[PDB]
Enzyme design. Structure first.
Site, PDB file in Angstrom:
ATOM      1  CB  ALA A   1       1.567   7.406   7.828  1.00  0.00           C
ATOM      2  CE  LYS A   2       3.234  15.211   6.795  1.00  0.00           C
ATOM      3  NZ  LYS A   2       4.148  16.262   6.259  1.00  0.00           N
ATOM      4  CG  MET A   3      -2.558   8.113   1.256  1.00  0.00           C
ATOM      5  SD  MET A   3      -4.042   7.290   1.837  1.00  0.00           S
ATOM      6  CE  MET A   3      -4.444   6.245   0.460  1.00  0.00           C
ATOM      7  N   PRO A   4       0.056  10.048  -0.209  1.00  0.00           N
ATOM      8  CG  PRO A   4       1.822   9.356  -1.544  1.00  0.00           C
ATOM      9  CD  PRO A   4       0.963   8.916  -0.382  1.00  0.00           C
TER      10      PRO A   4
ATOM     11  N   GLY B   1      -4.148   3.490 -10.062  1.00  0.00           N
ATOM     12  CA  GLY B   1      -4.979   2.305  -9.978  1.00  0.00           C
ATOM     13  C   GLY B   1      -4.472   1.176 -10.871  1.00  0.00           C
TER      14      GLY B   1
ATOM     15  CG  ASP C   1      -5.950   1.012  -4.989  1.00  0.00           C
ATOM     16  OD1 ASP C   1      -6.084   1.124  -3.748  1.00  0.00           O
ATOM     17  OD2 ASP C   1      -6.741   0.316  -5.697  1.00  0.00           O
TER      18      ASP C   1
ATOM     19  CE1 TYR D   1      -9.336  -4.765  -7.871  1.00  0.00           C
ATOM     20  CE2 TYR D   1      -7.417  -3.370  -7.667  1.00  0.00           C
ATOM     21  CZ  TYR D   1      -8.753  -3.605  -7.462  1.00  0.00           C
ATOM     22  OH  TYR D   1      -9.511  -2.622  -6.799  1.00  0.00           O
TER      23      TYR D   1
ATOM     24  CE  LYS E   1      -8.456  -1.439  -3.084  1.00  0.00           C
ATOM     25  NZ  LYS E   1      -7.760  -1.751  -4.323  1.00  0.00           N
TER      26      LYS E   1
ATOM     27  CG  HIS F   1     -11.419  -5.349  -2.250  1.00  0.00           C
ATOM     28  ND1 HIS F   1     -10.508  -5.933  -3.106  1.00  0.00           N
ATOM     29  CD2 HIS F   1     -12.103  -4.418  -2.948  1.00  0.00           C
ATOM     30  CE1 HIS F   1     -10.652  -5.376  -4.240  1.00  0.00           C
ATOM     31  NE2 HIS F   1     -11.600  -4.436  -4.229  1.00  0.00           N
TER      32      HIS F   1
END
Ligand SMILES: NC(=O)C1=CN([C@@H]2O[C@H](COP(=O)(O)OP(=O)(O)OC[C@H]3O[C@@H](n4cnc5c(N)ncnc54)[C@H](OP(=O)(O)O)[C@@H]3O)[C@@H](O)[C@H]2O)C=CC1
Ligand SMILES: O=C(O)COc1cc(F)ccc1C(=S)NCc1ccc(Br)cc1F
Length: 316
Positions: free
Chosen positions: A11-14, A19, A44, A49, A78, A111
């Site tokens: 796969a391709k990840m930008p 964040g 992300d 969070y 994560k 994480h």
């Protein structure tokens, strides 16, 4: 520059993402909506969070609005430390999926390499303030991650805050089924991470740089700590290129073949931080930025330093 990097899962990840740590829940929905409107295709996230539901409202609105197709988004979350138990990993992933309004993640990371006692508290402490560990190790937790791929919940798995020897442990796992696709680590001019990055890249793992601006909103900042955004040497490189200091700080990891995930909740900055595909730092600029290394970390935590798998005792 080319906007995506090929992962070892095909796969391709930008290479640029948004964040979300510290993004307040009342601001992050708008931040993510603006980010998607101005071109971001990678977000992300993390359970710890405490804002995935609000991130998910934004994602779902933009999908419903047909601003972007699900296949064009790259959503990362994560697994938190209190869910490194074979029987808890799937449920943890499914809670994040439910919060984000998704039926799969593009990438799911361990994480931290330290497991903690399960329970409601994210940092279970003993009466003297030390984190309470789990007995489960990074190899059994990795096997649990592999099951998520085979069940269709995640497209790729990876790691975060793993040191050189912990990466090696994973790569040397007996019966390894899927290699980690990514190691997400702190990286910026004051913590340049050359050794760890060369190791991971030599093994075909893609490195994601977190805290690329030095996390000036970290809760434990002290007024006197070094400040990347205010470093006049970095400001000078930015002025030469007619860019902002933040734009230089984002472009820097991109030219090291890293993915980078600056955080903002400010719409103007979200836009600023995406305008990093129309200038190039010279090799001399790159080497100059690398020269600023001081081995300084945003992300460390005293209460966790005796955990047997705490990552930052090791040189890298
Ligand atoms: N895997 C892990 O263990 C970790 C992962 N991360 C991930 O990395 C992301 C980025 O790191 P983070 O620590 O948040 O910090 P960053 O280095 O991304 O810095 C964020 C801070 O910079 C400010 N800022 C953003 N853009 C600009 C700009 N153009 N000009 C001036 N200031 C700006 C933001 O302000 P404002 O928002 O007010 O605009 C915020 O205060 C996290 O949000 C998280 O997704 C981070 C740490 C650990
Ligand atoms: O962790 C993040 O993504 C960003 O930071 C955090 C984000 C949160 F939502 C809650 C705590 C942290 C802390 S305090 N993180 C540091 C940290 C945690 C665990 C271990 Br092992 C060591 C360590 F250094």
């Amino acid at each position: 520059m080319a906007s995506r990097i090929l992962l070892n899962n095909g796969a391709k990840m930008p290479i640029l993402g948004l964040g979300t740590w510290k993004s307040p829940p009342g601001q992050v929905t708008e931040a993510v909506k603006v980010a998607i409107d101005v071109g971001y295709r990678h977000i992300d996230c993390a359970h710890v969070y405490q804002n995935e539901n609000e991130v998910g409202v934004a994602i779902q609105e933009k999908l419903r609005e047909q601003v972007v197709k699900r296949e064009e988004l790259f959503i990362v979350s994560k697994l938190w430390c209190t869910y490194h138990e074979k029987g808890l990993v799937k449920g943890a992933c499914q809670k994040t999926l439910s919060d984000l309004k998704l039926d799969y993640l593009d990438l799911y990371l361990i994480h931290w390499p330290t497991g903690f006692k399960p329970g409601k508290e994210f940092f279970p402490l003993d009466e003297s303030g030390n984190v309470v560990p789990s007995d489960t190790n990074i190899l059994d937790t990795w096997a649990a991650m592999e099951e998520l791929v085979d069940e269709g919940l995640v497209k790729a798995i990876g790691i975060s805050n793993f040191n050189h020897l912990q990466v090696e442990m994973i790569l040397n796992k007996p019966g390894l089924k899927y290699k980690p696709a990514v190691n997400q680590i702190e990286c910026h001019p004051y913590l340049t991470q050359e050794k760890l990055i060369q190791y991971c890249q030599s093994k075909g793992i893609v490195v994601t740089a977190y805290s690329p601006l030095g996390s000036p909103d970290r809760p434990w900042a002290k007024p006197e700590d070094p400040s990347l955004l205010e470093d006049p040497r970095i400001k000078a490189i930015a002025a030469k290129h007619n860019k902002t200091t933040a734009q230089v700080l984002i472009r820097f990891p991109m030219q090291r073949n890293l993915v980078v995930i600056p955080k903002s909740v400010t719409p103007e900055r979200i836009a600023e931080n995406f305008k990093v595909f129309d200038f190039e730092l010279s090799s001399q600029d790159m080497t100059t930025l690398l020269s600023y290394n001081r081995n300084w970390r945003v992300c460390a935590l005293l209460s966790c330093t005796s955990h047997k798998d705490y990552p930052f005792h090791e040189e890298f």
